[PDB]
A paper describes a structure:
Similar to some other predominantly plasma membrane proteins, ACE2 had a novel nuclear function: its cytoplasmic domain harbors a nuclear shuttling domain, which when demethylated by LSD1 promoted importin-α-dependent nuclear ACE2 entry following infection to regulate active transcription. LSD1 directly interacts with the cytoplasmic tail of ACE2, which harbors a novel nuclear localization sequence (NLS)/methylation domain. LSD1 demethylation favors interaction between ACE2 and importin-α, a key nuclear shuttling protein, increasing RNA Pol-II-coupled ACE2 in the nucleus of SARS-CoV-2-infected cells. Our findings show that ACE2 belongs to a growing number of plasma membrane proteins, that also have nuclear roles regulated via PTMs catalyzed by epigenetic enzymes that regulate transcription.
We also explored potential mechanisms of LSD1-mediated ACE2 nuclear translocation in silico. In addition to the N-terminal demethylation domain identified above, we also identified a high score (prediction cut off of 0.7 out of 1), highly conserved demethylation domain within the cytoplasmic tail of ACE2 harboring a high-affinity, highly conserved nuclear localization sequence (NLS) using both the previously mentioned bioinformatics tool from Wen et al. to identify the de-methylation domain (TGIRDRKKKNKRS) and the NLS prediction tool NLStradamus59 to identify the NLS within this motif (RKKKNK). Moreover, to assess whether LSD1 regulates the demethylation of ACE2 in the NLS domain, ACE2 peptides di-methylated at either lysine 769(PEP1), 770 (PEP2), 771 (PEP3) or double di-methylated at lysine 769 and 771 (PEP4) within the NLS motif were constructed and used as substrates for in vitro LSD1 activity assays. Recombinant LSD1 showed the greatest demethylation of the double di-methylated ACE2 peptide (PEP4) followed by PEP3, PEP2, and PEP1. We hypothesized that ACE2 demethylation by LSD1 surrounding the NLS or targeting the triple lysine motif comprising the NLS may influence interactions between ACE2 and the importin-α shuttling protein to translocate into the nucleus following SARS-CoV-2 infection. To examine the structural basis for any interaction between ACE2 and importin-α, we crystallized the cytoplasmic tail of ACE2 with importin-α. The structure, resolved at 2.2 Å, revealed ACE2 lysine residues forming important interactions with importin-α, and a direct, micromolar interaction was confirmed in both MST and FP assays. The interaction between importin-α and ACE2 c-terminal domain was further confirmed using an electrophoretic mobility shift assay. Examination of the interaction interface suggested that lysine methylation would cause steric clashes and severely impact the interaction between ACE2 and importin-α and its capacity to shuttle cargo to the nucleus.
Numbering used by the authors:
A (entry chain B): 768 to 774
B (entry chain A): 72 to 495
Amino acid sequence: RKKKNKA
Amino acid sequence: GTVNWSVEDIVKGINSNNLESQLQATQAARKLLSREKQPPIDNIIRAGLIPKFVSFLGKTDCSPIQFESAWALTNIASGTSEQTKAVVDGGAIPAFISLLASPHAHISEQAVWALGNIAGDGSAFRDLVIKHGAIDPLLALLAVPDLSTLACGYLRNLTWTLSNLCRNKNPAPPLDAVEQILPTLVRLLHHNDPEVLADSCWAISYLTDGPNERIEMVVKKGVVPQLVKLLGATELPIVTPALRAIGNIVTGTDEQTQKVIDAGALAVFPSLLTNPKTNIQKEATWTMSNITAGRQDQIQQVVNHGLVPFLVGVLSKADFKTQKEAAWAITNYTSGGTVEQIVYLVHCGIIEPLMNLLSAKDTKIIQVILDAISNIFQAAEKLGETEKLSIMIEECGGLDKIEALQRHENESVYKASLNLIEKY
């Protein structure tokens, strides 16, 4: 939601 | 090649001063940090690697290490508040802002993403990102004649990061930052990509979640009709933030609510008030409750759009939170409405579901329903039709529940119930 991991 | 390195080997590579060795180890760290099962963020932090990644951000002469360290730091900053803080403490913010203008699109996209994570931590880091001057280069990335020429992932990431700059309260974002961002937001709200639309509506919903002056900043840009259009969309990730924005807007003045009505919003509510997703129904009913707290002409437009039977329906059968919002809508209606409007509400069948809700274990909804019924009784007094209403209440089992509410824990509940049976 607020933060996004880049996989 | 660079797959499943140990943190020890990564440290050994980064602490050589062979630039290629450092790049290899940095990519190994990036791959470690981009695995789905428990990426060892805290191990990377404890090894002291963040200042090295941050310094790699400035190596203009070797674009790959810029990219790999930007990605690694992005994933560290995506974690807990303490992990994001470790990224910020390393001086990452100005270095990422510097990368925003890089000639390599994947590098500047990575910087956009990282700044999105940092700003998304909360108000303090959001405002710190703003103070370091991120807004101008971010918006400059979108200063093109047609947004469709930008890569879709790039545009989505920019929209998401802008929405995070629009997010959070206590305090809300700085007024001048909101003013600077809003025109680009308005343009993104007209783009054709569903994810861009969803994140733009989210940004607008954040900006309208506050006092009437914030709502006014948004409403003056003329976005309400586009919000209504998106309220009619088929994609739930678009309808949800669009509906939240519309509800926020109708928490404002009667004139802002009127702008929502003029744009045609009420014609969407037959669908929204029967929507199979519980949260849509709840938020649509809350929006309706804030519309029925408006003027009598606005209540009348609610009537004309045929929405009172839908309120009766939601009161009769819905998730309990939605039913509470419906009770609020009814009490607002009865407190603000004319006598003929309250008569019409009774003729649509509000009394029996209103009574049935009096057997709930929620004290606030009991108070709300009792206030609504006393308002209805007041209108009936003006018409001299009070005992027809009392017979209607008694034939559906309402008098039993109101009389039982006399022996109730809450003092206000007992007082209102005793008043009702003493008077009628």
